[PDB]
Amino acid sequence: GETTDGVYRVMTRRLLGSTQVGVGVMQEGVFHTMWHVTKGAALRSGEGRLDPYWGDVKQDLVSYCGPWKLDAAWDGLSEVQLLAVPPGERAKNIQTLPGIFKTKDGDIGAVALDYPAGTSGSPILDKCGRVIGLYGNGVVIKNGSYVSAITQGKRE
Amino acid sequence: DMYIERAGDITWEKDAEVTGNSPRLDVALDESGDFSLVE
Numbered sequence: 001g002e003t004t005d006g007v008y009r010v011m012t013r014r015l016l017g018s019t020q021v022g023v024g025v026m027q028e029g030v031f032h033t034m035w036h037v038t039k040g041a042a043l044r045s046g047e048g049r050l051d052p053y054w055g056d057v058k059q060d061l062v063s064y065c066g067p068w069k070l071d072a073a074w075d076g077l078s079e080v081q082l083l084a085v086p087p088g089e090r091a092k093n094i095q096t097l098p099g100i101f102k103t104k105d106g107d108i109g110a111v112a113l114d115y116p117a118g119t120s121g122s123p124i125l126d127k128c129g130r131v132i133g134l135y136g137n138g139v140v141i142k143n144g145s146y147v148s149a150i151t152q153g154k155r156e
Numbered sequence: 157d158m159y160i161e162r163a164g165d166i167t168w169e170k171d172a173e174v175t176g177n178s179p180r181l182d183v184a185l186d187e188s189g190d191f192s193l194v195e
């Protein structure tokens with residue numbers, strides 16, 4: 001199937017018609033997405049099969065065909081772009097200054113942009129175009145809006 | 157059966173729509189991977 005680097009939609013035909021359950025990144029022959037999008041299940045790319053290789057429910061990440069390849073990190077100062085791929089809609093870059101998730105184990109970048117649940121797995125990029133994490137796991141604040149963490153894996 | 161479809165290149169776009177605030181929030185992460193607000 002298609003292995004060209006880029007952003008991809010994750011679809012299913014189990015429910016009514018064709019539904020977009022999430023988004024992912026293809027880089028160096030490995031497909032990267034959020035665990036809640038696929039639940040670790042196998043994926044189809046045309047006539048080819050993508051088998052899970054690594055995953056972790058707590059980090060909410062999963063890689064297919066090989067180990068996690070994305071290792072860029074937000075610098076803590078600069079603006080970033082969410083390359084949002086919403087269901088049924090064209091890919092669109094949105095620039096924003098990330099906030100912070102403060103935890104008992106350290107701080108994490110956060111992006112306060114509102115998108116449907118099927119946009120989960122959309123990549124967040126730095127000015128060099130490097131993927132600093134995926135959008136889709138966060139919290140609902142007082143005003144009803146969604147604030148997602150910049151979720152990044154570890155490159156072994 | 158889940159399947160994938162290409163949606164675009166991963167590149168920074170000059171003069172893209174700039175929006176979104178930068179909130180500083182105290183959060184907790186549980187063993188199930190769910191974030192919650194700590195107050």
Ligand SMILES: C[C@@H](N)c1ccc(NC(=O)c2cc(Cl)cc(NC(=O)OCc3ccccc3)c2)cc1
Binds near residue numbers: 036060115135190
């Ligand atoms: C399984 C577990 N790790 C998990 C499973 C799933 C998820 N993520 C989501 O459900 C998700 C992802 C995105 Cl991109 C957006 C939203 N949307 C959302 O909650 O919107 C509320 C809202 C109300 C009123 C106005 C505006 C927004 C949810 C995280 C974690």
